[PDB]
């Protein structure tokens, strides 16, 4: 629900100018909003939920042969007919048995037989189709107040402080307004139906576990399949075989369990669990964060007059910021916690910015732990907690200097452009003009081009790109980039994006 210790933690730089913002989020990633008058926010997906799922069809991967029956007939008799062709449970096939005068017939060289075997399915997979309204999204939202190592990673604890909230956005109710209490209210307007594509794929159950598969590939699977209701199947002859015909003897043999082949047929499928509602891991949702009622109270709180302490030692979040936890032994609380991030000790001018804005002591109780995060600048810096003699400081250094960070925005920005489709420009939030046409140019470019030849797998589009790079070598003036258009970017990039 919060951004604490998440695998992917990305931030948001507030330019103010508007109280509303359109952001896209994910299950693994946690967005962090920092703005003026608005405290630090956490926005992430818990999982993707779906309420009602219809049964599209099923697939029998594992079968067994039962009741082999072959009716032998003489040559020149034409078709052979076994009485088992009436029931659909019996799998019947034409054929022949080369006849002499020794076996069953008075003629030579030819024959006719009808080989029927009752079909028995040992194991079958089942698919499921997703309805748009049934899709639910549990979106953890959190605002950073006074926190500890316990309550901050705790939900119900911050609900008592009204600093964390959960909710379910559906196409029936895409808009939800939740109050943060002392910090005001925020309005979240999402797009549940358009976050994913509900009809783009199915949910296939292989064995006990269920998995995601494209629905156009779902019907293109070659394997005996099943209608929703009960009985009559199609292509059930594929799991069984035939042999030579010696007199009346022909053995219909069944293929083994194809479950492994189904697991082999699954490559990019996402593992999905379930209990009473399916929980999808990687989220895609378009929400609107309205901060209008969210504000800062409590500027009435001056600095704290007493000693600090470290409840836990400082470390690096790996996302570019440094978090600390402080146990304040002074009894003068509630008070605004003095703290900064400075270049040198002789220079009291704050440089680094606090990730958690306005650190505050909850209650007058001494030794109360408080967890506050800050973003120091690049190079050698210092974490200074308190003013005067009361201060206890720490040295920090961060090698991520904007040279490499410019590429971390650039390179990941193109990675943000990839795999997000046309929604990639939603990071262009509070947009228009550029950001609007930047998505619009890529809109039809996303509705054509890459999607037209899309479906290429790994080196398929990657290898030919190197051959399409040769198209840029042979060309004419003003015709150079014409053969080079789709080559560089959008093609080799995603090939370099996923290596492996």
């Amino acid at each position: 629900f919060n951004c604490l210790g998440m695998g992917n933690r990305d931030f948001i730089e507030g330019a103010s100018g508007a109280t509303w913002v359109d952001l896209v989020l994910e299950g693994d990633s946690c967005l962090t909003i920092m703005a003026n008058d608005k405290p630090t926010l956490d926005v992430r997906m818990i999982n993707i939920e779906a309420s009602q799922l219809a049964e599209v069809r099923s697939y029998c991967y594992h079968a067994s042969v039962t009741d082999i029956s072959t009716v032998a007939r003489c040559p020149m008799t034409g078709e052979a007919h076994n009485e088992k062709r009436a029931d659909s449970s019996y799998v019947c096939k034409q054929g022949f048995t080369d006849r002499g005068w020794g076996n069953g017939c008075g003629l030579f060289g030819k024959g006719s037989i009808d080989t029927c075997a009752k079909f028995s399915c040992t194991s079958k997979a089942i698919g499921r189709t997703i309805q748009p309204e049934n899709i639910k999204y549990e979106v953890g939202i959190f605002v950073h107040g006074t926190t500890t190592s316990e309550n901050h990673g705790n939900y119900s604890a911050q609900v008592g402080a009204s600093q964390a909230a959960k909710f379910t956005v559906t196409p029936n109710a895409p808009s939800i307004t939740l109050k943060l209490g002392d910090y005001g209210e925020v309005t979240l307007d999402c797009e549940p139906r358009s976050g994913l594509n509900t009809e783009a794929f199915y949910v296939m159950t292989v064995g006990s576990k269920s998995f995601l598969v494209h629905r156009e590939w779902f019907h293109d699977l070659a394997l005996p399949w099943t209608p929703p209701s009960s009985t009559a199947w199609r292509n059930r002859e594929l799991l069984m075989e035939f042999e030579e015909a010696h007199a009346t003897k022909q053995s219909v043999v069944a293929l083994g369990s194809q479950e492994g082949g189904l697991h082999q047929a699954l490559a990019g499928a996402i593992v999905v669990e379930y209990s009473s509602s399916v929980k999808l891991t990687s989220g895609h949702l378009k929400c609107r964060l309205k901060m209008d009622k969210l504000a800062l109270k409590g500027t009435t709180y001056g600095m704290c007059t007493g000693k600090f302490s470290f409840a836990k030692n400082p470390a690096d979040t790996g996302h570019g910021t440094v978090v600390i936890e402080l146990s304040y032994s002074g009894s003068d609380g509630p008070c605004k916690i003095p703290i900064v991030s400075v270049a040198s000790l002789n220079d009291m001018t704050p440089v680094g910015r606090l990730v958690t804005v306005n650190p505050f002591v909850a209650t007058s109780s001494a030794n109360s732990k408080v967890l506050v995060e800050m973003e120091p600048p690049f190079g050698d810096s210092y974490i200074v907690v308190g003013r005067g003699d009361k201060q206890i400081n720490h040295h920090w250094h961060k090698a991520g200097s904007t040279l490499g960070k410019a590429f971390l925005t650039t390179l990941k920005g193109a990675q943000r452009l990839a795999a997000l489709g046309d929604t990639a420009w939603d990071f262009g939030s509070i947009g228009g003009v550029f950001n609007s046409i930047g998505k619009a140019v890529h809109q039809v470019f996303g509705g054509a081009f890459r999607t037209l030849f899309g479906g290429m797998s790994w080196i398929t589009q990657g290898l030919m790109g190197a051959l399409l790079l040769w198209m840029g070598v042979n060309a004419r003036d003003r015709s150079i980039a014409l053969a080079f258009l789709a080559t560089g970017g959008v093609l080799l990039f995603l090939a370099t994006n996923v290596h492996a």
């Binding site: 037209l452 030849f453 080196i459 398929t460 042979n474």
Partner: protein
């Protein structure tokens, strides 16, 4: 893995009905044809590469018909 590198073909004696015989003709083509139907936009620019280089006419198709078979399943 078991999916690829099949036993086929034995090709020692073996005049008989094997485990899978008639389905051996449907191994590559149909699965590669389902790939080129999967990716038609590639097939348009695919055969273009053949007419690009060499100016030798009939062997330019030798590029395409061979190269169009390369891309499916690499």
């Amino acid at each position: 893995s078991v999916s690829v590198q099949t036993h086929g073909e034995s090709s020692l004696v073996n005049k008989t009905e094997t485990w899978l015989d008639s389905t051996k003709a449907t191994r590559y083509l149909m699965k590669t044809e389902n790939w080129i139907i999967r990716n038609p936009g590639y097939a348009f620019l695919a055969a273009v590469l053949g007419w690009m280089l060499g100016s030798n006419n009939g062997q330019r198709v030798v590029f395409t018909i061979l190269l169009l078979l390369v891309a499916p399943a690499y």
